């Protein structure tokens, strides 16, 4: 039977102060017995044997062995990884420990912008950006690694250095995208590498999965008030679709209609597990005197055979 290894260790006092010496008694029990040679490892290399003060307590066949090591305080407060490593019957049974400090030595934040279906199904020319925040303006450079899973050759990316108004530096980077690889869900990764780094922060992404669902569309206009006979508003309804990324657009009189005039609501689910989103846009006078066919249009994947559903409207 193989043993299991456990460590029992010294306590800081009622004032929470470390003891000036640290007593490391590892408790070892639970084995069909045999030869036992314990080694101590400070950071993986074999420590000296003289400061190992072991004890072999055996009760019948149950053997509760215990090996005491003695450090000073800053020996432990050197943040070294310490280890009790028993060798049982030719095997090895090892328990490790290290100075338990606080946490979060960085917590870097970055971003990634998966593009619009407008740049996939209308403009069809996608360029993806991965967007790092919190960059220390310093001397040693970064080594960026845009990367894939398919292992195929790449184009050229960007690199945008700027010192930031609140003191720091900023680098983001941008890459153009192929179309169908994302439609077949190819996975991408841009990678950091810097001299300050004891770690490295990497994020990857691909096309978000799930089942597929096609939506249902209406749109409704403004019955006028006595106050406003020229200025009205539109709004457009959608419901029950999956997955839920859309480019929403606006059509009238072969004009891709402008933006800050209108606004658009947020992705919110339905109880029937589809989503539903809206938008709005005002009306002016002379435009209906010009022409009356208007489309709040949108780009859904399960919309087909052109990834869109459109609804031309008219007055009254």
């Amino acid at each position, epitope marked *: 039977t*193989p043993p*299991t290894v456990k460590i029992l260790q010294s306590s800081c006092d009622g004032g929470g102060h470390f003891p000036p010496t640290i007593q490391l008694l590892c408790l070892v029990s639970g084995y069909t017995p045999g030869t036992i040679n314990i080694t101590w490892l400070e950071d*993986g290399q074999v420590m000296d044997v003289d400061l190992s003060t072991a004890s072999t307590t055996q009760e019948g066949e149950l053997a509760s062995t215990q090996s005491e090591l003695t450090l000073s305080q800053k020996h432990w407060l050197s943040d070294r990884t310490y280890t009790c490593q028993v060798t049982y019957q030719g095997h*090895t*049974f*090892e328990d*490790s420990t290290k100075k338990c400090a606080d946490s979060n030595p960085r917590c870097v934040s970055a971003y990634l912008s998966r593009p619009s279906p407008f740049d996939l199904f209308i403009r069809k020319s996608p360029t993806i950006t991965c967007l790092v925040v919190d960059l220390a303006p310093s001397k040693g450079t970064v080594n960026l690694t845009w*990367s*894939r*899973a*398919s*292992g*195929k050759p790449v184009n050229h990316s960007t690199r945008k250095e700027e010192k930031q108004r609140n003191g720091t530096l900023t680098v983001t980077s941008t890459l153009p995208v192929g179309t169908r690889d994302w439609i077949e869900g190819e996975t991408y*990764q841009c990678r950091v*590498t810097h001299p300050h*780094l*004891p*770690r*490295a922060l990497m994020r990857s992404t691909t096309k978000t999965s799930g089942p597929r669902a096609a939506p249902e569309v209406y749109a409704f206009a403004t019955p006028e008030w006595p106050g406003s006979r020229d200025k009205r508003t539109l709004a457009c309804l959608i419901q029950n679709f999956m997955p839920e990324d859309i480019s929403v657009q606006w059509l009238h009189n072969e004009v891709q209609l402008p933006d800050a005039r209108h606004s658009t609501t947020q992705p919110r689910k339905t109880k029937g597990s589809g989503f539903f989103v809206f938008s709005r846009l005002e009306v002016t006078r002379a435009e209906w005197e010009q022409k009356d066919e208007f489309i709040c249009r949108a780009v859904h994947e399960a919309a087909s055979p052109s990834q869109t559903v459109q609804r031309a409207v008219s007055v009254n």
Partner: antibody
Amino acid sequence: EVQLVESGGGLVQPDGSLRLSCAVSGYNITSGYSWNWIRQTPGKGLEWVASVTYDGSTNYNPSVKGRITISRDGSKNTFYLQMNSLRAEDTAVYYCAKGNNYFGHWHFAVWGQGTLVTVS
Amino acid sequence: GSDIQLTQSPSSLSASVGDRVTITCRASKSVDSDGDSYMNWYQQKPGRAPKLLIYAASYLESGVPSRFSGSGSGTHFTLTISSLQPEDFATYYCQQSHEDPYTFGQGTKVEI
């Protein structure tokens, strides 16, 4: 997505020859990702055999290199393995898989059922 | 030959449901390269296909509970599990992904 039909397992004779097969449901196998033959000796370890990529760049296990050949048909979208000069130790369970890479380091997420080929 | 010889630890185990358990694959050389080791840990259920559990020893596979935790560096490499369930009791594996050919352990099966 991709689905696996191993084909070519059973009882075989030593010092002979065997062409393997593993049928792929749902891909054009000439596109990308490696195509691989992986073995499992039962009661024993795990045995990678060989690999061919989409372009056809090809690696073998050097312990088995000199004994075995891997073939492919991407119009059929199926790759094969003509193994020759069999041994007594080759009684094992055989998993075909596809390569998935990151920085030249590869991984096989998908697994077939695995086919036991026992030499007799 | 000169392969980095694996040492899974322990060999097997029996437990109860809910136990916080910890396991180490022990290596011989260090595959920490660009601050990064190339190591994945695995599992196959009895009479089934295998299953990758965590890629690059730090990055999960999709559709898992968060009750698991991998660790380790240099030649020591460690998985910890916080809460045990009955559907977890099977044999688990690990593999280096640094220098070709890629090597393997013996598998440690956990019982309840």
